[PDB]
Design a protein around this nucleic acid. Structure first.
Length: 73
DNA sequence: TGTGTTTGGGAATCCGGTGCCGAGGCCGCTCAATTGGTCGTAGACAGCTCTAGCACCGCTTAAACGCACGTACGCGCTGTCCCCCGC
């Protein structure tokens, strides 16, 4: 399954008012059996694609270093 | 949601009493500083030599300088996780 679903599912499972950090996303995908080490660069890209698709709102920071929430709009 | 002011309350500080022990003074003594004198020599001074430090010049080339260009490291920001702190 593509990493955009795994990320969206992790952000939905940890839904809050702040927003899953990249470190929490790493932890959730690793707990989901996804190798976050080798494919970290893929994650940053896929995450960026999800922000560029507007599917994730950046709530703090800039780019992948930030916190993110599912764009309910 | 955010900026700003206020109060009980522990903790450091001030003040007065007090008492106690070491610092300051006094005395008797002694031994080390002082006086005077002799004598030896350490070094102050003159004087002489020669070396090695300074100033200069010219030439070559290697290093320093300025500049272009790119990337990688420093630094700021965010997050988390845990391990020292206060009690």
């Amino acid at each position: 399954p593509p990493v955009s679903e795994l990320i969206t599912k992790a952000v939905a499972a940890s839904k809050e008012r702040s927003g899953v950090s990249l470190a929490a996303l790493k932890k959730a995908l690793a707990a989901a059996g996804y190798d976050v080490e080798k494919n970290n660069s893929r994650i940053k890209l896929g995450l960026k694609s999800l922000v560029s698709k507007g599917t994730l709102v950046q709530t703090k920071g800039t780019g992948a270093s930030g916190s993110f929430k599912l764009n309910k709009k």
